[PDB]
Amino acid sequence: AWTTTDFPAFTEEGTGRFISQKVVEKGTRPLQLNFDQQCWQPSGGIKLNQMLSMEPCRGTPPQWRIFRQGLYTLEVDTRSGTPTMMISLEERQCPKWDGKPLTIDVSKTFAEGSKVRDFYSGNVATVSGGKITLQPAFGSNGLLLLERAETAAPAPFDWHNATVYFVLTDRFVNGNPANDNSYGRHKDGMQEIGTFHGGDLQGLTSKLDYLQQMGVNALWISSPLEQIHGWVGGGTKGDFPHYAYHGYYTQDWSKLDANMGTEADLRRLVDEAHKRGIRILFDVVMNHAGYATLADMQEFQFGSLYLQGDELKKTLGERWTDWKPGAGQTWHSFNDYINFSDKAGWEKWWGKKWIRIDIGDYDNPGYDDLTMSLAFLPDLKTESKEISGLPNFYSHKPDTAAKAIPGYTPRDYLTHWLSQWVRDYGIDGFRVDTAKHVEMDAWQQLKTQATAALAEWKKANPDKALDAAPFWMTGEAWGHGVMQSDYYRHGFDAMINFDYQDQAAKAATCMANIDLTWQQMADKLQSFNVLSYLSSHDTRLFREGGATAAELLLLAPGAVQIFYGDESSRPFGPTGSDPLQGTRSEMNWQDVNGKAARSVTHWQKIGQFRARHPAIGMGKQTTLSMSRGYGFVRESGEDKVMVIWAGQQQ
């Protein structure tokens, strides 16, 4: 019932939002939205990709200026009470689409006389002569998501149909600003490339409904465990202070990092998530501890400085971590104050039984994946059989839950420390970092202990547990593809798939180009699982897919990983002299309620569809042969879907 001249009637794309699309030639035209006899118009000028205020129609209608030809989207939002609206433009051996309805042969898929729903539109059609006719809705990108109209709700969770949301908690939602500066951490007052922005568990807990609406059923959070308190030089040029905002620079595995919140905050995160049918994954590290920082050296009384006497307080200050680089220095310059050769000083850190590192009197790193010091990080001796006792510097850390345990090796402590979280909070699985730099046996020990820990909790908490499924574990082995490697026989249920990113890239301008990849994956993954992604914190943000990134990821066989902000085209941020930093940019919440709202809606719909159909993640694929457009069927057990893509609208 929303309309404007020379554009189709608006359809609802999300509650309270209505949109319309058309290919429009260059030129100028008036702009009024009508809803019956209500007439509205832009009151504050006309720009693209901005929330336009609107007034009741008076005088001459505002003149909208069409600079470039293309498919435009008009949106109107009634959620605020008064109508706002928005305009946006979507700037070959590829199937073309005239824009008009499609007639699909469904004779081998859906029963004669039955009802078939296109989930995206909600339109339902009765199979007659083995055929249905349907118009792809606005925002579909020409998709039909065909299911039996009987389909009503989400299907039972399966890890092979999982929609995993991977979030860097610090960069998501700041629920409580009070804990932003734990252990004397500061903002840099520059571009905050490597600082703690202040995102926390409380904040994340506040967005569980939003995640639930996307059809997310697994939440992978950055490690919430206590990190190094200080910072190191950021990037190749030391143009920013690098803090452990990502969770990969752990110091105490036994405690939560104060930036993240309290024990109660975690309990609420996990319990609320479970209530919504969302599983929880901790990012975990056993390869390395965090770098030595001034904050930690001072606090826990380890390491060695070249500065002696009055020179120490006058250069580094009362709190050494408050040091900032002066003229002619970088954030790497502080290293010149540190004496990394002093044996006694640096033994007071982790200690010779715990880590490998080219410092002091430590065991030197090896020249292979397993024993090397990855980017100069202290390499934990997971393969050691030596009884170690606690790390030396823990003697000056009275707030630790870590107790010395008779007979324990460094590995035994680590697996105990991680499993305790599983035991206490009912963490459903892990994502394992740096998988190829730790021996397979260690991962097996982690899995065994974690499996036991989860089973113990579910038995203790029968009210809370969703099912009796076993602990799950995925891993990052660098460059891993769609292959059932030996990781699968040392405790990994799935490995992260590095190859999907490039395949999706080749289908960014033409969705149908993914067909061969999807066929191969659907077949290969009949006997195992992988976790595929478009975007990651150590590759890039995938933004070349126009509006089609949702379907490219979410219709993939196997488990899939949404990197926070994929749904809202979160932009690459300031990155300085480390090319990876921009991928950890702040979540663009302002865009989520504004210019990215229809994108978010698009992801919600395609994700909700996947959640209803295990055949997407698990089923065997048959690619349809048609004269127009592209289409396939997938089938797993009683579940069956048909996906049709009309093709390019221009």
Give the footprint of Ca ion on this chain (CB under 5 A).
174, 176, 179-180, 198, 200, 287, 379, 437
β-pair partners for 648: 96
CB nearer to Ca ion: pick between 146 and 446? 446
Site size for Tb ion (CB under 5 A):
1
User: To the nearest whole angstrom, how small is the minimum distance from the Cβ of residue 282 to Ca ion?
Assistant: 19
**Shortest distance (Å) from residue 368 CB to Tb ion:** 6
CB 57, CB 17: distance < 8 Å: no
Is the CB of residue 563 less than 8 Å from the CB of residue 272? Answer: no
Q: Is 437 annotated as a binding residue?
A: yes
Question: In sequence order, what are the beta bridge partners of 124?
Answer: 117
Among Ca ion, Tb ion, none, what binds residue 174 when CB lies within 5 to 8 Å by partner kind? Ca ion
CB of 81 to Ca ion, least distance (A): 32
Binding map of Tb ion across residues 96-135, x = CB under 5 A, - = no contact: ----------------------------------------
Return left, alpha or beta for 379; rule: phi > 0 is left, psi -120 to 50 is alpha, else beta.
beta
Structure tokens at 154: 């989400």
DSSP state of 60: S
Which DSSP state fits 346? H
Q: Is 439 in the site for Tb ion (CB under 5 A)?
A: no
Which of the listed partners (Tb ion, Ca ion, none) does 197 bind, with a CB threshold of 5 to 8 Å by partner kind? none
Residues 6+ apart with CB under 8 A from 540: 501, 572, 583
Nearest-approach distance from CB 357 to Ca ion, in angstroms: 11
The entry of Ca ion, Tb ion, none near residue 412 (CB within 5 to 8 angstroms by kind) is none
Q: Which is nearer to Tb ion, 439 or 499 (CB)?
A: 439
Beta bridge mates, 555: none
Residue (of 635, 604, 601) closest to 620 by Cα position: 635
Annotated ligand binding at 287? The verdict is yes
Task: Give the gyration radius of the chain's Cα atoms.
Answer: 27
Question: Which helix (DSSP H) or strand (DSSP E) does residue 287 occupy?
Answer: none
Alpha helices in 525-628 (DSSP H): 549-554, 589-592, 597-612, 614-618
Residue 119 vs residues 98, 136, 150: alpha-carbon distances, Å? 21, 10, 11
> In terms of CB distance, is 256 or 525 closer to Ca ion?
256
Q: Which is nearer to Tb ion, 384 or 485 (CB)?
A: 485
Between 288 and 480, name the residue whose CB sits nearer to Ca ion.
288
Nearest to 501 by CA among 547, 556, 574, 435: 556
Q: Is 180 annotated as a binding residue?
A: yes
Q: Choose from Tb ion, Ca ion, none: what does 639 bind? Cβ within 5-8 Å by kind.
A: none
Cβ nearer to Ca ion, comparing 197 with 279: 197
Calpha distance 326→488 (Å, rounded): 51
H helices, E strands: number in the chain: 14, 32
Q: How far is the CB of 437 from Tb ion (least distance, A)?
A: 8
- Tell me which of Tb ion, Ca ion, none is bound by residue 369, counting a contact when its beta carbon lies within the kind-specific cut-off of 5 to 8 angstroms: Tb ion
Question: Is 176 known as a binding-site position?
Answer: yes
Active-site residue set: 433, 476
The 348-387 site mask, x for binding Tb ion (CB under 5 A), equals: ---------------------x------------------
Contacts of 553 (CB under 8 A, 6+ apart): 504, 532, 533, 534, 560, 562, 566
Instruction: Map tokens 């010149």 to a residue.
Output: 336
CB of 370 to Tb ion, least distance (A): 6
Q: Which does residue 198 bind out of Tb ion, Ca ion, none, counting CB within 5 to 8 angstroms by kind? A: Ca ion
Detail the residues annotated as belonging to a binding site for Ca(2+): 174, 176, 179-180, 198, 200, 287, 370, 379, 437
- The binding site for Tb ion (CB under 5 A) comprises 369
Q: Which residues are annotated as a binding site?
A: 174, 176, 179-180, 198, 200, 287, 370, 379, 437
